Design goal:
It is classed as viral protein. The entry lists the keywords SARS-CoV-2, Omicron, S, Trimer, Antibody, viral protein. The entry is titled "SARS-CoV-2 Omicron Variant S Trimer complexed with two JMB2002 Fab". Chains A, B, C, D: Spike glycoprotein. The structure is cut from a larger assembly and holds 4 copies of chain A. Chain A is mainly beta. In chain A, the strands form 2 sheets. In chain A, strands 3-6-5-4 form a 4-stranded mixed beta sheet, with no helix packed on it. Chain A has a two-stranded antiparallel ribbon with strand order 1-2. The termini of chain A are far apart. The relative contact order of chain A is 0.19. At the A-B interface, strand 8 of A face helix 1 and strand 2 of B. Strand 8 of chain A pairs antiparallel with strand 2 of chain B. The structure holds a molecule of 2 linked components (NAG-NAG) and 2-acetamido-2-deoxy-beta-D-glucopyranose (NAG) (7 copies). One 2-acetamido-2-deoxy-beta-D-glucopyranose (NAG) binds next to loops of chain B. One 2-acetamido-2-deoxy-beta-D-glucopyranose binds next to loops of chain B.
């Protein structure tokens, strides 16, 4: 249609708008690019691998659980 | 005990609700069913292919051609359909190999998790595995893995050993935590501080060799009996 | 251990008729072979992506190593990501990537996860295992000094933890020496990375033989469709075109079948790699000879162009 | 390490075990004499 054109390593993507922030991968395109429908229009973005956090490592620091949550998960 | 039982019941109910509500939780069997259906469809669909013949209906070519000429087109159709069936058989063999691998994995999981308590990290679900329950499915098995997930972690400062009477003391089955200003011995996977004593610690060597050793007292349960 | 293979896509119409207007219509008479081949290849590609996701996406959070990289004498410089290189790969990762190296209707589709993201996953796993031991693989990541983590891992092999504290410096020196020698072992060996190179060579050879068979006549007067359509009448050209088409379709189907078998092999390898990750990187394995020869202490994953390398 | 009652446990008399040997086992409470 030519409304919007974006170049990707997998090829030329038309009809999707590239957004400068990352989400979880909904529809995989390739080369780290994924597309999704968000507030509505189809958007293209680099997939996010997950939340980033730094473990408070120290020479004399240890963390110990004071509680527990026994959980049941399903495998098929 | 009561809290653990309540947690287990809530988790079972949550599994029930998730299975009831989730749209595509059982995709690993729907995929097998869909693959079988698609294979049969393409096998039947290939039956309508002409394979270069004038027609795909054998009676038609029989009627509109002489035997000498009909023979070549019938040979073409025979070859096409035989090749289609060969391809179907090969694909079924590959799918059967995949299903055999899946069934071997299922049997191993049943043995390890249901008939025992696997110590493998992710073989019987996320977290420390306690037990599992098998549930029948139309073309597979569903495993409900009960696991122990630690939660509500608190940070403490620790030392590798305790120096008392010029000797290095190590924890027999625990870790040393300081609680800011009071040292205790606690199990790794649950916070249960206890006073450091000769019963829960063992001694090996002097304090000059251990790096990070800290000064603290070790209580002797036999000390009070001075008389 | 290889984890994935090249994602191949083929345009059957172009491969069989080579972009010729004449037999493109004739190829329609043969049915839905093209759809079958396309579906099989798409399934193989999605399976490769799933294999990569399963092997490398076992950690939910991207753990980051602390700035003060002191771990009781242990030196993970060779395995931790480099700060200055644009790829941010580690030394051993750079060496592994350097050691192995690599129309008519056949093309290669890129993987969903790029090398940078696989390196990020490897860095997350390395940070988690270095800073929290086994905890990050079973729930909340709990910090612990590396010396105490190695002491715990010593208890897992039946050796009292005091043996480590009284020999911490020697153990750290041995670890550093072994890590350094790994670089030399990988560089000097002519076939250390033989399996990944074998996968790449198999893919390239399959593509080459598929391309080469276009020149075969298959009993026809010539292998060029334009020639036959130019000097042979339709009644006599049709038989030759059919002779070429059947052979080319058979070649493509053989390629697809071999690709399916090799993809099953790659899936087995990827499942083994995922199990190895879970049981050696995210925990300590009591299984004999499953995470290296000897009593397993811990393992480190390293990214490779088409697989994973475990430093047991 | 020295053989003591802390690192050893008793099970029956010593006429039922093949290869048993005669040796002393030290009791840490014996010299304490509480
Ligand atoms: C245990 O083995 C290690 C490794 O061979 C020994 O450490 C070496 O000891 C020699 C002699 O003192 C030194 O020249 C080397 O530099 C040491 N190597 C390292 C990596 O430190 C250690 O001495 C041995 N211990 C015992 C009790 O035999
Ligand atoms: C995305 O953000 C970065 C950092 O602000 C900027 O350099 C880049 O130009 C932005 N790209 C687009 C397409 O907005
Ligand atoms: C450690 O715990 C103290 C209180 O016990 C808290 O103030 C501090 O923020 C904690 N630090 C980390 C890194 O968790
Ligand atoms: C643990 O620390 C708190 C504050 O540092 C202190 O009030 C408390 O007494 C300590 N625990 C014990 C058993 O003394
Ligand atoms: C590491 O912690 C231990 C225990 O608190 C302490 O004895 C040692 O001095 C510390 N080392 C450094 C370099 O801070
Ligand atoms: C521990 O106490 C002893 C005396 O009982 C002393 O000689 C030693 O220096 C102390 N260690 C530290 C780290 O303060
Ligand atoms: C770690 O090892 C590398 C390679 O031997 C060396 O260049 C680096 O200085 C070492 N780091 C430390 C802190 O010793
Ligand atoms: C061990 O000692 C007991 C009691 O002194 C004695 O009866 C027995 O013969 C001894 N056995 C050996 C093998 O010396």
């Amino acid at each position: 249609t030519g409304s919007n054109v974006f170049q990707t390593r997998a090829g030329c993507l038309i009809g999707a708008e590239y957004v400068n922030n990352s989400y979880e991968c909904d529809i995989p395109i390739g080369a780290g690019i994924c597309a999704s429908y968000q507030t509505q229009s189809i958007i293209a973005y680099t997939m996010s691998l997950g939340a980033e956090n730094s473990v408070a490592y120290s020479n004399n620091s240890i963390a110990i659980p004071t509680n527990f949550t026994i959980s049941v998960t399903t495998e098929i | 005990q009561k809290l653990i039982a309540n947690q287990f019941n809530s988790a079972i109910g949550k599994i029930q609700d998730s299975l009831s509500s989730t749209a595509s939780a059982l995709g690993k069997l729907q995929d097998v069913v869909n693959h079988n259906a698609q294979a049969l469809n393409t096998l039947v669909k290939q039956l309508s292919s002409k394979f270069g013949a004038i027609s795909s209906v054998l009676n038609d070519i029989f009627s509109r051609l002489d035997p000498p000429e009909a023979e070549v087109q019938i040979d073409r159709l025979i070859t096409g359909r035989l090749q289609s069936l060969q391809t179907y058989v090969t694909q079924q063999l590959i799918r059967a190999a995949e299903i055999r691998a899946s069934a071997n994995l299922a049997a191993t999981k049943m043995s390890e998790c249901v008939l025992g308590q696997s110590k493998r990290v992710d073989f019987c679900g996320k977290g420390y595995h306690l037990m599992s329950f098998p549930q029948s499915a139309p073309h597979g098995v569903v495993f409900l893995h009960v696991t122990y997930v630690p939660a509500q972690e608190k940070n403490f400062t620790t030392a590798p050993a305790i120096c008392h009477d010029g000797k290095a003391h190590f924890p027999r089955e625990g870790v040393f935590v300081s609680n800011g200003t009071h040292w205790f011995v606690t199990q790794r996977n649950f916070y249960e501080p206890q006073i450091i004593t000769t019963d829960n610690t063992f001694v090996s060597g002097n304090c000059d060799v251990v790096i990070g050793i800290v000064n603290n007292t070790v209580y002797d349960p036999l000390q009070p009996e001075l008389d | 251990l290889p984890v994935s293979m090249t994602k191949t896509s083929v345009d059957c119409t172009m491969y069989i008729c080579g972009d010729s207007t004449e037999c493109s219509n004739l190829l329609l008479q043969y049915g839905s072979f093209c759809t079958q081949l396309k579906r099989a290849l798409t399934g193989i590609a999605v399976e490769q992506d799933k294999n990569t996701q399963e092997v490398f996406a076992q950690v939910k959070q991207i753990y980051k190593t602390p700035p003060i990289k002191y771990f009781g004498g242990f030196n993970f410089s060779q395995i931790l990501p480099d700060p200055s290189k644009p790829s941010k790969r580690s030394f051993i990762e750079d060496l592994l990537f350097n050691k192995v190296t690599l129309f008519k209707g056949l093309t290669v589709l890129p993987p969903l996860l790029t090398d940078e993201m696989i390196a990020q996953y490897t860095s997350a796993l390395l940070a988690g295992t270095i800073t929290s031991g086994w905890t990050f693989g079973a729930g909340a990541a709990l910090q612990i000094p590396f010396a105490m983590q190695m002491a715990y891992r010593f208890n897992g092999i039946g050796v009292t933890q005091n043996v480590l504290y009284e020999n911490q410096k020697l153990i750290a020196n041995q670890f550093n020496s072994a890590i350094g020698k790994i670089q030399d072992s990988l560089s000097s060996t002519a076939s250390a990375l033989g399996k990944l190179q074998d996968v790449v060579n198999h893919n390239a050879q399959a593509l080459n033989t598929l391309v080469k068979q276009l020149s075969s006549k298959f009993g026809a007067i010539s292998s060029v469709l334009n020639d036959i359509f130019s000097r042979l009448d339709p009644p006599e050209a049709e038989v030759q075109i059919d002779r070429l088409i059947t052979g080319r379709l058979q070649s493509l189907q053989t390629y697809v079948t071999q690709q399916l078998i090799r993809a099953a092999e790659i899936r087995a390898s990827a499942n083994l790699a995922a199990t190895k990750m879970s049981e050696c990187v995210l925990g300590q394995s009591k299984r004999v000879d499953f995470c290296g020869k000897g009593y397993h202490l811990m393992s480190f994953p390293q990214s490779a162009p088409h697989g994973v390398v475990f430093l047991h």
